[PDB]
Design a protein around this ligand. Structure first.
Ligand code: HEM
Ligand SMILES: C[C@]12CC[C@H]3[C@@H](CCC4=CC(=O)CC[C@@]43C)[C@@H]1CC[C@@H]2O
Ligand SMILES: [K+]
Ligand SMILES: [Mg+2]
Length: 406
């Protein structure tokens, strides 16, 4: 714990709070190390906003000098987070809008109303599971019984993933995200995931349905998307759709239970559940780091330069704790704070999250339904002793022991 001018991101997530504070105090641009690979980290709000609209920063991995020289390869444990197939994720420019449009149109709040009953149905279902599990005052894992399955169910409904394949998806993703997965196994899981979605796209081509995957395939709007692009989008939509939303639900519940006066505020209708959700995103949101962007040429920030070829990471957790924007109490959870909804936790610029409306809806429906159903819900384990899974880029809580109460 001597001074270092490069900040190593610990992959066991041993001290997230401290690391997040360190990242802020070294910011708003600072050198980080990711499992032995160097990059810059944007930890400031204003500077992130600027760079996320800066055209000289591209997603394409071939723009990465460390990928050109071959000093970073597929053996890097984080490689699956950026070296993926052509999709809205990995593209920039006029091409990019073509890859987003059907998704953004499908995920407008008004189109989402059609999905609302389905979400309600799954929330009711899994609450029933919660009732049965937590009977006779037993300790229950809120994640595995409620928060983990709900978002997969919902995104699978939207994309048209069959009910019976979802378990296997969840197993893959656990392996994919965990630092502890052997790299040879992770890459194999990555190939198996690719294989599954390739066949899902072929199936939806042969027999299209009332789902977004079928819309990605057959476009009214009216050049049709290629096979790589449909598959690519599909992958991005399910992975993101599931992994982030799980976190958002668990962190909201933790935040509110650990600040019961504030839970009271939303229950008695003085602050919207929605606002509670926004402050959760600012304070304790699903994304820790977002890999990764690359400079097509030198980028001059006045008293700093991002060199051509260099990798740039968006540290969205640190950005949410920005004191310049949120004030001295940034590190506090406060759903009444004036800047609650002024975060960029869904991102900014062209690559801004297209599912943001769905995420907000899922949480807005899930949270009041949870606490209405179980008003004396409380932790069977001190909330501050709930550990993160060793997942470096994602705010992935391990387990959430509760009693239904009463
Ligand atoms: C709490 C929930 C969520 C959080 C915190 C979140 C956050 C983000 C962020 C920060 C990005 C990109 C930021 C950047 O490029 O720098 C993103 C991209 C994306 N997200 Fe969301 N997201 C959430 C839920 C979702 C949902 C529900 C979906 C789909 C239903 C989704 C689908 C996508 C896709 C496909 C991309 C890549 C978009 C692109 O690069 O153009 N995410 N997510
Ligand atoms: C980075 C991310 C989790 C990993 C996702 C990413 C969307 C694109 C994507 C496609 C894949 O095939 C692997 C998972 C990834 C790399 C998600 C967007 C927000 C979320 O934090
Ligand atoms: K690839
Ligand atoms: Mg120094």
């Amino acid at each position: 714990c001597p001074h270092s001018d490069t900040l190593t991101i610990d992959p066991m997530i041993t001290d997230l709070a401290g690391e997040t504070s360190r990242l802020r105090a070294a910011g708003p641009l600072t050198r980080i190390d990711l499992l032995g690979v160097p990059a810059l980290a944007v930890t400031g709000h204003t500077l992130a906003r600027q760079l996320l609209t800066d055209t000289r920063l591209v997603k394409d991995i071939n723009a990465w000098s460390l990928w050109q020289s071959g000093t970073v390869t597929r053996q890097w444990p984080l490689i699956g987070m950026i070296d993926v197939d052509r999709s809205m994720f990995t593209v920039d420019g006029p091409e990019h809008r073509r890859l987003r449009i059907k998704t953004t149109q499908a995920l407008t709040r008004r189109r989402l109303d059609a999905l609302k009953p389905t979400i309600e149905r799954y929330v009711a279902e899994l609450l029933d599971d919660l009732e049965r599990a937590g009977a006779d005052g037993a300790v229950v894992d809120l994640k595995s019984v409620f928060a983990y399955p709900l978002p997969m169910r919902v995104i699978s409904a939207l994309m048209g993933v069959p009910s019976e394949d979802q378990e296997q998806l969840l197993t893959w993703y656990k392996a994919f995200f965990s630092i502890l997965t052997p790299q040879d196994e992770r890459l194999r899981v990555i190939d198996e995931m690719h294989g599954y979605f390739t066949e899902m796209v072929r199936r939806k081509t042969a027999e299209p349905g009332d789902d977004l995957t079928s819309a990605l395939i057959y476009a009214t709007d009216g050049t049709p998307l290629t096979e790589e692009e449909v598959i690519g989008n599909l992958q991005a939509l399910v992975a993101a759709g599931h992994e982030t939303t799980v976190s958002l639900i668990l962190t909201a519940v933790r935040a509110l239970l650990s600040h019961p006066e504030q839970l009271r505020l939303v229950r008695d209708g003085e602050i919207g559940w929605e606002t509670a959700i926004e402050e959760t995103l600012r304070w304790d949101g699903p994304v820790i780091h977002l890999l990764m962007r690359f400079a097509t040429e030198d980028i001059d920030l006045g008293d700093a330069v991002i060199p051509r070829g260099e990798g740039v990471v968006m540290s969205y957790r640190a950005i949410g704790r920005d004191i310049t924007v949120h004030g001295a109490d940034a590190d506090d959870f406060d759903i009444t704070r004036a800047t609650a909804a002024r975060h960029i936790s869904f991102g900014h610029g062209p690559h801004i999250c297209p599912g943001a409306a769905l995420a907000r809806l899922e949480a807005a429906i899930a949270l009041p339904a949870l606490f209405t159903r179980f008003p004396h819900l409380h932790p069977a384990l001190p909330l501050d002793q709930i550990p993160n899974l060793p997942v470096l880029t994602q705010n992935d809580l391990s387990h959430f022991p509760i009693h239904l109460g009463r």
